[PDB]
Motif scaffolding. Structure first.
Motif, PDB file in Angstrom:
ATOM      1  N   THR A  93     -14.078   4.496  14.762  1.00  0.00           N
ATOM      2  CA  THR A  93     -13.252   4.808  13.611  1.00  0.00           C
ATOM      3  C   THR A  93     -12.216   3.741  13.312  1.00  0.00           C
ATOM      4  O   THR A  93     -11.566   3.818  12.266  1.00  0.00           O
ATOM      5  CB  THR A  93     -12.532   6.160  13.794  1.00  0.00           C
ATOM      6  N   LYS A  94     -12.030   2.768  14.203  1.00  0.00           N
ATOM      7  CA  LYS A  94     -11.076   1.682  14.021  1.00  0.00           C
ATOM      8  C   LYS A  94     -11.738   0.385  14.445  1.00  0.00           C
ATOM      9  O   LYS A  94     -12.595   0.383  15.336  1.00  0.00           O
ATOM     10  CB  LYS A  94      -9.801   1.863  14.857  1.00  0.00           C
ATOM     11  N   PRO A  95     -11.317  -0.738  13.881  1.00  0.00           N
ATOM     12  CA  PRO A  95     -11.904  -2.016  14.298  1.00  0.00           C
ATOM     13  C   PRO A  95     -11.617  -2.274  15.771  1.00  0.00           C
ATOM     14  O   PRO A  95     -10.645  -1.764  16.339  1.00  0.00           O
ATOM     15  CB  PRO A  95     -11.199  -3.042  13.387  1.00  0.00           C
ATOM     16  N   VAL A  96     -12.508  -3.031  16.409  1.00  0.00           N
ATOM     17  CA  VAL A  96     -12.267  -3.433  17.788  1.00  0.00           C
ATOM     18  C   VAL A  96     -11.017  -4.280  17.837  1.00  0.00           C
ATOM     19  O   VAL A  96     -10.809  -5.157  16.987  1.00  0.00           O
ATOM     20  CB  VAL A  96     -13.479  -4.185  18.363  1.00  0.00           C
ATOM     21  N   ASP A  97     -10.162  -4.009  18.828  1.00  0.00           N
ATOM     22  CA  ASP A  97      -8.877  -4.686  18.947  1.00  0.00           C
ATOM     23  C   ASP A  97      -9.006  -5.889  19.871  1.00  0.00           C
ATOM     24  O   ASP A  97      -9.256  -5.706  21.065  1.00  0.00           O
ATOM     25  CB  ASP A  97      -7.825  -3.713  19.474  1.00  0.00           C
ATOM     26  N   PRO A  98      -8.806  -7.123  19.382  1.00  0.00           N
ATOM     27  CA  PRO A  98      -8.979  -8.290  20.265  1.00  0.00           C
ATOM     28  C   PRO A  98      -7.937  -8.375  21.351  1.00  0.00           C
ATOM     29  O   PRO A  98      -8.150  -9.069  22.356  1.00  0.00           O
ATOM     30  CB  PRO A  98      -8.877  -9.475  19.296  1.00  0.00           C
ATOM     31  N   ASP A  99      -6.806  -7.692  21.185  1.00  0.00           N
ATOM     32  CA  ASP A  99      -5.837  -7.623  22.267  1.00  0.00           C
ATOM     33  C   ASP A  99      -6.395  -6.847  23.453  1.00  0.00           C
ATOM     34  O   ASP A  99      -6.062  -7.157  24.599  1.00  0.00           O
ATOM     35  CB  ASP A  99      -4.542  -6.991  21.764  1.00  0.00           C
ATOM     36  N   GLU A 100      -7.238  -5.842  23.203  1.00  0.00           N
ATOM     37  CA  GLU A 100      -7.862  -5.134  24.309  1.00  0.00           C
ATOM     38  C   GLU A 100      -9.211  -5.712  24.703  1.00  0.00           C
ATOM     39  O   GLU A 100      -9.594  -5.592  25.872  1.00  0.00           O
ATOM     40  CB  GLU A 100      -8.003  -3.649  23.971  1.00  0.00           C
ATOM     41  N   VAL A 101      -9.934  -6.342  23.775  1.00  0.00           N
ATOM     42  CA  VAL A 101     -11.260  -6.888  24.077  1.00  0.00           C
ATOM     43  C   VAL A 101     -11.296  -8.350  23.640  1.00  0.00           C
ATOM     44  O   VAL A 101     -11.878  -8.673  22.589  1.00  0.00           O
ATOM     45  CB  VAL A 101     -12.362  -6.075  23.381  1.00  0.00           C
ATOM     46  N   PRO A 102     -10.672  -9.259  24.388  1.00  0.00           N
ATOM     47  CA  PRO A 102     -10.467 -10.619  23.872  1.00  0.00           C
ATOM     48  C   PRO A 102     -11.740 -11.395  23.614  1.00  0.00           C
ATOM     49  O   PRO A 102     -11.697 -12.370  22.856  1.00  0.00           O
ATOM     50  CB  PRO A 102      -9.615 -11.280  24.966  1.00  0.00           C
ATOM     51  N   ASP A 103     -12.875 -11.008  24.194  1.00  0.00           N
ATOM     52  CA  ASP A 103     -14.096 -11.765  23.975  1.00  0.00           C
ATOM     53  C   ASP A 103     -14.968 -11.167  22.882  1.00  0.00           C
ATOM     54  O   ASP A 103     -16.004 -11.748  22.558  1.00  0.00           O
ATOM     55  CB  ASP A 103     -14.884 -11.887  25.283  1.00  0.00           C
ATOM     56  N   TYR A 104     -14.542 -10.051  22.275  1.00  0.00           N
ATOM     57  CA  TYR A 104     -15.345  -9.394  21.247  1.00  0.00           C
ATOM     58  C   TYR A 104     -15.684 -10.364  20.118  1.00  0.00           C
ATOM     59  O   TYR A 104     -16.842 -10.474  19.698  1.00  0.00           O
ATOM     60  CB  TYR A 104     -14.605  -8.164  20.704  1.00  0.00           C
ATOM     61  N   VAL A 105     -14.686 -11.106  19.637  1.00  0.00           N
ATOM     62  CA  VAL A 105     -14.906 -11.975  18.491  1.00  0.00           C
ATOM     63  C   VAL A 105     -15.845 -13.127  18.837  1.00  0.00           C
ATOM     64  O   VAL A 105     -16.356 -13.796  17.926  1.00  0.00           O
ATOM     65  CB  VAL A 105     -13.543 -12.483  17.970  1.00  0.00           C
ATOM     66  N   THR A 106     -16.067 -13.399  20.130  1.00  0.00           N
ATOM     67  CA  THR A 106     -16.975 -14.466  20.546  1.00  0.00           C
ATOM     68  C   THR A 106     -18.436 -14.025  20.553  1.00  0.00           C
ATOM     69  O   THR A 106     -19.318 -14.887  20.633  1.00  0.00           O
ATOM     70  CB  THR A 106     -16.608 -15.009  21.938  1.00  0.00           C
ATOM     71  N   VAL A 107     -18.695 -12.721  20.459  1.00  0.00           N
ATOM     72  CA  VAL A 107     -20.041 -12.169  20.424  1.00  0.00           C
ATOM     73  C   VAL A 107     -20.408 -11.666  19.031  1.00  0.00           C
ATOM     74  O   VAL A 107     -21.511 -11.919  18.544  1.00  0.00           O
ATOM     75  CB  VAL A 107     -20.166 -11.036  21.472  1.00  0.00           C
TER      76      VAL A 107
END
Lengths: 133, 7
Positions: free
Chosen positions: A33-47
């Motif tokens: 329901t919310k975008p993935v938070d890069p502060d909690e998942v720092p490698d998300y944007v790399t995948v």
């Protein structure tokens, strides 16, 4: 004048907002329901290059980005495929989120198949095609 | 796939 095409899109958006709301209040899908938070998942944007979540789907309904159920399910499928591409299968939390991603996809598909008139969807698809041409 | 979200 043929404002009937706009009537189709209005009825489609109302239907899409109702479907999205039912997905967003389902406790299983709170993580979507919310975008993935890069502060909690720092490698998300790399995948994941094209992030998507149910709150962004609502905004796209509002901005008239969905002319067809296919366009809408593409974004539901994106939520699911992002989760399945990003998340590994290494602990129970991983398995849980991956199961919820598939259940999100399957729930959206099942609601649309049960509740959406096939000729209404085809009309929407074909207006989109006429407008492309 | 990535690290996962378990922390």
């Amino acid at each position: 004048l043929e404002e009937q095409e706009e009537d189709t899109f209005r009825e489609l958006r109302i239907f899409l907002r109702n479907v999205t709301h039912r997905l967003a209040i389902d406790k299983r899908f709170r993580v979507f329901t919310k975008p993935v938070d890069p502060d909690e998942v720092p490698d998300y944007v790399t995948v994941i290059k094209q992030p998507m979540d149910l709150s962004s789907v609502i905004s796209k309904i509002d901005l008239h980005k969905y002319l067809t159920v296919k366009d809408y399910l593409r974004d539901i499928d994106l939520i699911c495929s992002n989760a399945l591409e990003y998340n590994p299968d290494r602990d129970p939390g991983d398995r849980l989120i991956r199961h919820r991603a598939c259940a999100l996809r399957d729930t959206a598909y099942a609601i649309i198949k049960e509740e959406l008139d096939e000729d209404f969807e085809q009309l929407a698809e074909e207006i989109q095609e006429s407008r492309k041409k | 796939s990535g690290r996962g979200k378990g922390g």
